[PDB]
RNA sequence: GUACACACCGCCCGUCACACCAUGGGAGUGGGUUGCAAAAGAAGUAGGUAGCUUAACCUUCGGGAGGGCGCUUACCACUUUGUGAUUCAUGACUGGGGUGAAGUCGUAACAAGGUAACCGUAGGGGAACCUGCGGUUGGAUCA
RNA sequence: GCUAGUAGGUGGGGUAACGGCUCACCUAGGCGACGAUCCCUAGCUGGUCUGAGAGGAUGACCAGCCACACUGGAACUGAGACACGGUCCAGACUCCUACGGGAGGCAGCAGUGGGGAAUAUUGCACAAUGGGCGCAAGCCUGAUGCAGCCAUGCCGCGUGUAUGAAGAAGCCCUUCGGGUUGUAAAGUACUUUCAGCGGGGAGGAAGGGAGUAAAGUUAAUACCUUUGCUCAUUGACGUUACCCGCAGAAGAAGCACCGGCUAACUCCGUGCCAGCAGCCGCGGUAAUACGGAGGGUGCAAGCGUUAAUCGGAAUUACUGGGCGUAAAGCGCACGCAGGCGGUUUGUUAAGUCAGAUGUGAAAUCCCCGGGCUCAACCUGGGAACUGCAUCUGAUACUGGCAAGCUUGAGUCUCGUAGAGGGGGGUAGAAUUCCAGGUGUAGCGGUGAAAUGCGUAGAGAUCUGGAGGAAUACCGGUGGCGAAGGCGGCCCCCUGGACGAAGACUGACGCUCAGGUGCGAAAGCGUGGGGAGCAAACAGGAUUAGAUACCCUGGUAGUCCACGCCGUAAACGAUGUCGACUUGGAGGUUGUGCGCGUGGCUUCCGGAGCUAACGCGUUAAGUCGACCGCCUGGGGAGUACGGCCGCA
RNA sequence: AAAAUGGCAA
């Protein structure tokens, strides 16, 4: 590009949309389970993951993936979401705190336990 | 289901007032059941939900736990067809009380012994679920 | 067209160089031999004459030290495209000093450090390394 | 030569069936915002004066000057009407796209892929495609 | 595209003041591709974060400016307001009421409800600084000084420290030998910051109020003022910093991670399950990747996770990238605006350069210092603020003006080659059709067949006629044209290129967004024409099927005039113009004297370049000017809107 | 002459 049609019309940057457009901005943001149901994952990987769809208090609905082994969670269970999506399961893009509001740390752990929500023994 | 949502804070402001007033969802059937000190004491609750919070909702007395078993014994072929899977399965009643039993008689290998578990866990996956209701 | 008559001269230079010839013949002007003038007391250029009258040609002496170009590299900073303009602080340095950065001051064409001392900025020619 | 590399028992295209996701259209429908043509006229401010009234000034002592009030006019907020634009939401149904699963039908390309392939264009056909016309090599072969 | 107070003018009114500020009248202007208008978003700045820098992102705290004060609107008073704690009106809300009518505005401080992932006490003092009023005393001050809450951050410090093999137990691992935890712990000798208890103790305090003295002032040693002098007095913080004393290791470590990237490894459980995951991936019975344990690594009153910004990203490349084949050269050309432009002299000084001056708030940043036990933090001075205006110099270069020159470009004279274009005409060969003669049973087609044709005489052969279309050989890696393209011969009209030797003009040039023209085939419209060929279509075959390949037929179309379309693997997948940089063999077309010198073209190849393949004086080498274009694959060159088109 | 196809796997 010679500069006088850089003068012209200048370069642009890319726009570079987020990749959580839920929590918009937020670092976690509240919703309530409408529905708890397990999916299977992509190849190559086989399991039955546990998944939520909650509406957010920004009125997003968005599947979130309940972490850890076991949860307590229902529908109509009140939750916080923090971003990070689920390599295998298509459209999560979202993670459910365990210890934050109805979500219960996971059971018998003992490492980990601030990203699982567990008090120390 | 908008009126469940107005219907749960009402609950929850019925159970704020009145304490012997306990209102929980089943998570098994998805039934919210109200226990109460009286009938009339419920009919009020229920009344009040309807008339002070505009919710719509049918009262019943709560699904009592029910389990289905069988009357006949009967010998039935389990055929699914490369994917294969053939099965020979002969189901026959037990006394009252007596459990769930399942007997492997498969001898000299018609079914290969990797086979056995999955066989057991398609068995007790589908009674679990049941058969009638 | 030779919009650009200094980078050609550059540019002969350059091609002579690589080719091993012994001389560049170009057709003359004033700042072309001022160029040449600071090439040779450098000691980039051997020699420069210039001949005819109605149409005179300059014609640049190319030296080789080891059977290798003296100069290195020669580019045209300053182009018709774009033209770069220095203050004497910003005068610019060649290969850490190695090199020569040919300048249009005021009072004539001269190196960048002989700029430099004068404190004089100007246009920036080209840089020869 | 090759788009194959558990290596042609390779690779791989499209219709159709099913579930789901985002999206376009759609009798329209309901919000937001706004353009234009009008309407409207609280208060205030300015202008005029049917009338009413008047500490300081003047006066022939009667009044005069000047002012206030009221009325009226101009401007103008709310508000109101018609007709457009734009944006958002939703809509029986419908178009194309994407993602599964070992569904169904073929085999279009990759080897000369068994009618070389492909480009533009036109016609035809369940589908991949097929055919005509012109163009390209980003075709193999040649003993 | 936009605009009628609109643009300007004249007069009048108006403001503190200029002014369409306003009004009348007059003229028809003003604005915009250097983006008007409109739509969306937004307080601005000094600064902050990031970055080597250039940039990129951002504008919380502190400071400057601006706007706003329930919403909408208006004015009054005043030096100043169209006024947070003023007025009036209207509206929405809340409240009072005797129902007639009234009251109110936390985006001051604290606080409540609500919303949210989330953000503090309805504190103390006016002791200091500053402000209002006052002669002053003083009064007022949710400014401000302080306290409370919060690991939110930054900084500093502690949680002991020497000794300690018993290499204890206990844990984990183990080849059961042992190794590891680990001198770690016990054991022993010390130290006591900080916390706690006790006792001392700065500084922030200046001033003001009493007197008292002198001087000034005055009629006055009055009073007042001024400066000294003397005596009590002023501190919210506050149980202040700090010092000192006392007891005792007492009262004080957690979080994430260990497949690779990435420093840190095994064991056991589990078995494509449960699970993990930023990326790559791991898990199906020998998992350093899941969960737990031992051990280790990294950090530490924090440690992770999430969100957000910059970097790495040369991945929008100004610094600092590309476009033969990876994504990227417009199909080709003409050309306006724009960009750029040979050589010489004078002149000017716009750019450029130098110096000077004014300014660029303080703070921040940076450097050198100083003060808190140190540090964070506070602070003095300097630097820096890269900018801008003005003035005075310099003149190389760029630009302007003026005069030149010939070298670029162009004009003329002469000749050469050419399927260059448009128009009219004509010839020969062949096919088809029609008529007649001869003649007899096949013809035609295919891998093989069949459909089809023929005894109503085919096919074959000969003769005459008609009509359309294309021009064998020449013919060529040949030529011509910007590209698309252009092929028998003849005439007519017309374009371009090249060579030779002179003359002539005097930079008259190059590129080119927008714009305009031309632009294969197919297709469309109107009117003609129709031999052959042939989408569609029909029949026969082939096949599992055969909407095909093959066979027999056959319509549009192919042809002509005119009009439209505007696209192709429109390809050299290579933009245009100019300069420079080894060779060889050929083609075609001039020209000079076998040897030269021009134009064009084909193949090979050196340096160099390239990821390689290749390119290689016809560059994809080396440079310059200008333009077009690209930024992962799909979705998609599609949807929508616009423009254009008969479609 | 005709001559289709072989899920995804480690
Ligand atoms: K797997
Ligand atoms: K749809
Ligand atoms: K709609
Ligand atoms: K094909
Ligand atoms: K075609
Ligand atoms: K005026
Ligand atoms: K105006
Ligand atoms: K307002
Ligand atoms: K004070
Ligand atoms: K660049
Ligand atoms: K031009
Ligand atoms: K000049
Ligand atoms: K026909
Ligand atoms: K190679
Ligand atoms: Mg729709
Ligand atoms: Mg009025
Ligand atoms: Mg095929
Ligand atoms: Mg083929
Ligand atoms: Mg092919
Ligand atoms: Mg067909
Ligand atoms: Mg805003
Ligand atoms: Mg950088
Ligand atoms: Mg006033
Ligand atoms: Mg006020
Ligand atoms: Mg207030
Ligand atoms: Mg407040
Ligand atoms: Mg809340
Ligand atoms: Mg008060
Ligand atoms: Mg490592
Ligand atoms: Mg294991
Ligand atoms: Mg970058
Ligand atoms: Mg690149
Ligand atoms: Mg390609
Ligand atoms: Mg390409
Ligand atoms: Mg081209
Ligand atoms: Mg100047
Ligand atoms: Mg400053
Ligand atoms: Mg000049
Ligand atoms: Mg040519
Ligand atoms: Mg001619
Ligand atoms: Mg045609
Ligand atoms: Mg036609
Ligand atoms: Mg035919
Ligand atoms: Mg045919
Ligand atoms: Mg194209
Ligand atoms: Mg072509
Ligand atoms: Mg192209
Ligand atoms: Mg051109
Ligand atoms: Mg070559
Ligand atoms: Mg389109
Ligand atoms: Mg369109």
Request: net charge positive; hydrophobic share 35%.
């Amino acid at each position: 590009a010679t500069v006088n049609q850089l003068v012209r019309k200048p370069r642009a940057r890319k726009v570079a949309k987020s990749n959580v457009p839920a929590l918009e901005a937020c670092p976690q943001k509240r919703g309530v389970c409408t529905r708890v149901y397990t999916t299977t994952p992509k190849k190559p990987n086989s399991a039955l993951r546990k998944v939520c769809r909650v509406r957010l208090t920004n009125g997003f609905e968005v599947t979130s993936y309940i972490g850890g082994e076991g949860h307590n969670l229902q529908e109509h269970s009140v939750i916080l979401i923090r971003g990070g999506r689920v390599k295998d399961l298509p459209g999560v893009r979202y993670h459910t705190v365990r210890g934050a509001l109805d979500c219960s740390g996971v059971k018998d752990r003992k490492q980990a336990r601030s990203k699982y929500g567990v008090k120390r023994p | 289901k908008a009126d469940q949502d107005k219907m749960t804070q009402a609950l929850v402001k019925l159970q704020e007032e009145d304490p012997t007033f306990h209102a929980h969802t089943d998570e098994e059937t998805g039934q919210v059941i109200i226990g109460g000190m009286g009938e009339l004491h419920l009919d009020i609750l229920v009344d009040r939900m309807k008339k002070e919070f505009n919710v719509e909702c049918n009262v019943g007395a709560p699904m009592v736990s029910y389990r289905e078993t069988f009357k006949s014994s009967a010998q039935v072929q389990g055929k699914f067809s490369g994917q294969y899977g053939d099965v020979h399965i002969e189901f026959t009643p037990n006394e009252t009380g007596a459990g769930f039993e399942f007997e492997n008689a498969i001898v000299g290998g018609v079914v290969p012994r990797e086979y056995i578990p999955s066989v057991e866990a398609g068995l007790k996956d589908a009674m679990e679920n049941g058969v009638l209701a | 067209s030779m919009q650009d008559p200094i980078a050609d001269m550059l540019t002969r230079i350059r091609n002579g160089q690589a080719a091993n010839k012994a001389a560049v013949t170009m057709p003359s002007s004033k700042l072309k031999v001022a160029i040449a003038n600071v090439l040779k007391e450098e000691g980039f250029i051997e020699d420069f004459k210039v001949e005819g009258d109605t149409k005179p040609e300059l014609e640049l002496t190319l030296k080789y030290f080891q059977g290798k170009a003296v100069v290195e590299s020669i580019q045209r900073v300053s182009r018709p495209g774009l033209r770069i303009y220095k203050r004497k602080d910003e005068l610019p340095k060649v290969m850490a000093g190695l090199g020569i950065a040919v300048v249009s001051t005021s009072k004539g064409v001269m190196t960048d450090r002989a700029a430099r001392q004068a404190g004089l900025g100007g246009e920036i020619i080209c840089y020869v390394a």
